[model samples]
Each structure stands twice: as structure tokens, then as C-alpha cells.
Target chain A: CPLMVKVLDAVRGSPAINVAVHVFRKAADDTWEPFASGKTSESGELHGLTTEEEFVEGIYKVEIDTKSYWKALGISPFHEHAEVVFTANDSGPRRYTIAALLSPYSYSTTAVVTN
Target chain B: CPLMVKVLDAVRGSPAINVAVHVFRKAADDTWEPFASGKTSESGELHGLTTEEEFVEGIYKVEIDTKSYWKALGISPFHEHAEVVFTANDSGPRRYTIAALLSPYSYSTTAVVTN
Candidate 1:
């Protein structure tokens, strides 16, 4: 696998389980085409968004449906949604672990990549 | 002042200096109205985005221009820009510190609030 995601709940101080995450590739015409999608597990991690062969060089977007996550917990969130967009495999195939810290009013995303 | 920001360079492992940050408030008409703007300091922090008296209960947007920051360093980044949107002072006025971690291919934003 070339891609993985981890989501943490800043308020709960734990992994954000069952949060939806979607991956999309930017088409040549500037439209986002869906690539893969999954929900976080008990440990707040999701894997297999794309294999090394399928995920080629291009711009990709990762959407984290944070609003629903907070709303499900009976808290109102600020963002309608949170997303991470980046160019992947531009130089070469790399392993990526995109991490997010979520709050009712804010969120943070950090990417850890290795060649 | 009730609002502050800190931006970090995940790639360079230092404070992201001279990066532009802007603040906006969501108006009753659902439009984003400019509230304040500033640049990150040498320590990757910006202060005085708004005064406590001025930052009332409302939805606000915070934007960080990470694309230009990486481009100036002769590297291409993923997102055109990064932003954080959230409701503030819903219950009462509080101090806010928005922290962002940036990389050419990724970024994260976190908020620390206090009464």
C-alpha cells in the first residue's frame, strides 16, 4: 500500500474511529475524480486507499468528513468538511501517512511521507 | 487581543516566516467579510489579528498561504492555499492560538483556546 490515514480527536485525546475519508485524483480537466474511500477503524487509522501501482503521479485530494464526526458526538463543528490536497508521486512513489487532529471548532492535518 | 497564530514548516523544521495570514468573519448574508490580516513572525507566530472586544460571536475564517511559502523556497506545494473555518466566542470570548504545520505536500492546523 502507498497511502494510509490516521485521525485523532483532539478533545477526546484518542483516535477518531469510524470517520469517513475519501480520496480523489484531479483529472486533467481540473475535476476531481474519486479514487478510493474508507472509514477510520477503532485505532483511528485507515489503509489501502491506493496501491503503489494504481496511485501514480498526480494531484490528489483527501476529504475528511469532520462535521459529521463531531455532529454524531452531539457537538457542532465549524467546518462543513476538512480536506487535504497534495501532489503525490511527483518525483517517485512514496509511502504517505496523513494524520489529522480534529476539534469542534478547528482541525489540523500533517503528512508523513517516506520514499 | 483574542486571536493569535503560529505557522511551522514541516519540511524545514523551523518557523515559517513572512507567510501571509488573513482573517474573515462570516456575515449575515453568508459572505466572508475581511476582519484582519498579518504575516507570521520569525518565531512562526502572528498576534493581534483581532481585539477581544471586536471578536464577538461569529463564524470566522483563517487562511494560510502555504503555496507561496513553499514556492519561494523553490519547491512546489500541493494545496493552492490552506484555510481553517470555525465559529468563535459562541459561549463567551476566549483567547485563541491557531497553529499550523506545513510541508510541500502537506499541512496541519490546530487550535488552542482558553477562557
Candidate 2:
């Protein structure tokens, strides 16, 4: 897989299970065309967001629907949604892993890239 | 001061210097009242964002002006801004450090809380 995500719940200090993730690729016209979507597993990971063939060098967006995640927990969050945007495969084909930590009012995301 | 921030440039793998930071406290009417503002130092850290007395038990917001930071480096980032919002002092007075890692297209923020 070219991309994967790991979600954690900061409040509970556990994996953020069942969180929704949406992936998109930037088109030539600067439009975001959806590429893939999935939910976090029990281990708080979503693998296979894209394969190497589909994930070409370009700008990509990863939107985490954290609002719904918080709401389900009976808590309201601040942002409408948490999204990550970045350029991929610019230098070369690399594996990307986004580690995201979430709180009711706060969230953090980190990317670990490797060859 | 009860809150501080450390910012890192993931692309360059260095401290994000001179990045602007704004702090806000939530009012009873749900308005965000400005509390303080500053810029990251050479070490990519902003200290003294608020005093313990001023930072009572309430919701708080920390906004990072990342767009300007990237623009200064001749890069166009994805998000207009990055922010972290959370409640503080609910249990007691504690110190907070927000560690933010930034890339042109991606950013991650994590909080280290201590009594």
C-alpha cells in the first residue's frame, strides 16, 4: 500500500476505532477527486488507502471525520473536520503513514514516510 | 504561564522559527476572547502564552498561522491555518506544551500536559 493511517484517542489513551477517513487526489484543475475512503479498524489503522499505481505524484488530501467521532462519544468538537493535505511522490515513490491523535476539542496528526 | 508550544518543520526537519501563534479563551457566550499572541523562537517554541491566574478552567484555542510560515518559504500549503482547541484547568492547574510538526501539505499537533 502507498498510504495508511493510524488514529488514536487522546482522551482515552487508546486506538481511535471506527473513525471515518476520506482520501482525495488533486486533479489538474485543482479539484479534489475522491480516490478512496474507509474506517479505522480495532487497531486504529486503515490500510490500503491507495496502491502505488493509483497514488501518483501530486497533491493529496486526507479528511478525518472527527466531528462525528466526537459526537458519537457525546462530546462536541471544535473544527468542522480535520484534514491533511500534502504532495506525494515528488521525490520518488514512498510509503506514508499518518498517525493522528484526537481529543474532544483537540487533535494531532503526524506523517511517517519511508522508502 | 501555563501554556507553551513547540513547532517543527517536518520537511526541513528543523525548528519552525518566527511562526505566529494566537491564543483564545472561550467566553460564557461561546465567543473566543483573545488572550495572547506570540511567535515561535529560534527553537520553534513559544513560551508564556498565558498565566495560571488568567488561564482558568475553560475552553481554549491555539491558532497557528502556518500559511504565512510556508509562504515565507516560497511554498503553498494546504490548510489556511492550523488550530488546536481543548479545555484546561478543569481538574486543576496544569502546564501544557503543544508540539506541532509541520509540512507544506501536512501538519500534526500533540499536547504534553503536566501538573
Candidate 3:
């Protein structure tokens, strides 16, 4: 199943900031393939390149570049990189979405696969 | 539209631990209603009580009790509570799910509403 990934900039007071997101899939040989890339909008939102219909069941990782995003704001980040790992068992009728919110101090990610 | 919320304990080494989750909906009069409550499993996972068919579109807040969860492990917490605020616009055909992964120092939340 194809994984849907979204990245958000959760800095409350700042305007929409640009962020670089990289999506990688774990290959059989234990390597990662750079599958997708994108940036967040002014509202700090980006949709995944893959749709529910195109999802393939596998292990996936979504990486966000927090260091640059925070550097633009003159802030130092505690975490250099933020990555989320999740598995897609059976892609059912529901839309499967994974999202991450990033800031200088923290980041969060979630995976939802609907049955 | 109804909001589906989930909570998970993202502590890497720990087994499924119990953590309390509280859901609050902002009333029109500027008050919060304690709409739902639950705990994460040994793997630190909890599903929202509301289904896709039952969600109402509005502002919703999901709160996690991190203070007690860390206390159980004899760990001091940097954050006492973690809350996620999101809006459900139109709960369409897709299954809407919101999930949170929390530890003593950090947490994350995501909202997915399928149209």
C-alpha cells in the first residue's frame, strides 16, 4: 500500500514557513529509497504525493529538515532530524494518512490506517 | 462530523503502559466539555470513542496526562500535559482519525479527515 505523508510547521506565532520533507521506503536490502519530496505552505501544511488508492503496504519513513527551518528564524533546534516510522498492514476503504508537526523545540508524527 | 481521536505512549523500551486521555470540545459559550476519557494499552495505544459516522465538525482538544505516566516510571517530566487542537471541517466518506504519541518530554498529534 502506498503511504500518505503530510508535514506541518507547528510554530504558532510565525507565519507560514518553508520546510523540506523527504520520504523514504525501507527496501528489502535494508536501504532507503527517496520516494517523495515537498515543502509546507504558509499555513504549515503539505499533502502526501501518494493517494489512498495508490498506497502500497510496506515500511515507510518520513523525514523533516528542522535545522534549516529553525535557522531561518534565528533559533537553535534541540533535534537535528525528525523521522516517523510506520507500517501499512492492509489498505482498507479508509484513507491512510501520516502527518508530522515540526518546531525548533519539538516534533510529532502520527499514522492512521482505516479498516 | 465526528472526530476520532487516538493516544499512544511512544516510549521506545517500555511495554504497553496505561496513560489517561481527556477530550474536550469548546462550547459556544467559551467553555470546555469533558466529552471523552480513556487510557492507552500496554503498547500505549488508545482509540477515540467517536467514529467517522458520528463526528461533529468543530474545534476539539485532546489532552494527555504525561505527569502521571512519567511518575509511574520514576522519571521527571519536562511537560506536565500535552494538548492537540484541530478542526473537523467536513467529515466525508473517509474515516477521520486523530492520533497522539507521547513521552515524558515530547508528544505529537495529527488529524485526518477524508472527504
User: Chain A vs. true chain A, TM-score per candidate?
Assistant: 0.97, 0.96, 0.75
- Candidate order (lDDT): 1, 2, 3
What does the lDDT read for residue A5 in candidate 2?
Answer: 92
| Model 1 agreement with the true structure over B61-105: per-residue lDDT tens digits | 788876566668776564524667777898898888888787655
List fnat, each candidate.
0.41, 0.18, 0.00
Candidate 1 clashing pairs, residues 3+ apart or interchain:
A108-B109, A109-B108
Please write out the lDDT profile of model 2 over residues B67-93, one tens digit for every residue.
Answer: 567778776553424666667777899
For model 3, how does the per-residue alpha-carbon lDDT over B1-115 read when each residue is reduced to its tens digit? Answer: 3444455555542323577878877789978877777877754566666665545666778887888878887888888788887665544344445545666777666554444
Q: Which ten residues in a row have the lowest lDDT in candidate 1 chain B?
A: B75-84
- The parts of candidate 1 lying over 4 Å away from their true place are A9-14, A24-36, A47-56, A70-82, A93-95, A101-108, B9-14, B24-36, B48-56, B67-82, B103-108
Model 1 TM-score is: 0.66
Better of 2 and 3 by DockQ: 2
Docking class of 1: acceptable
DockQ of each: 0.30, 0.15, 0.06
Superposed by TM-score, candidate 3 places the C-alpha of residue B94 at a distance from the truth, in angstroms, of 30
Candidates' lDDT values, in order?
A: 0.82, 0.79, 0.64
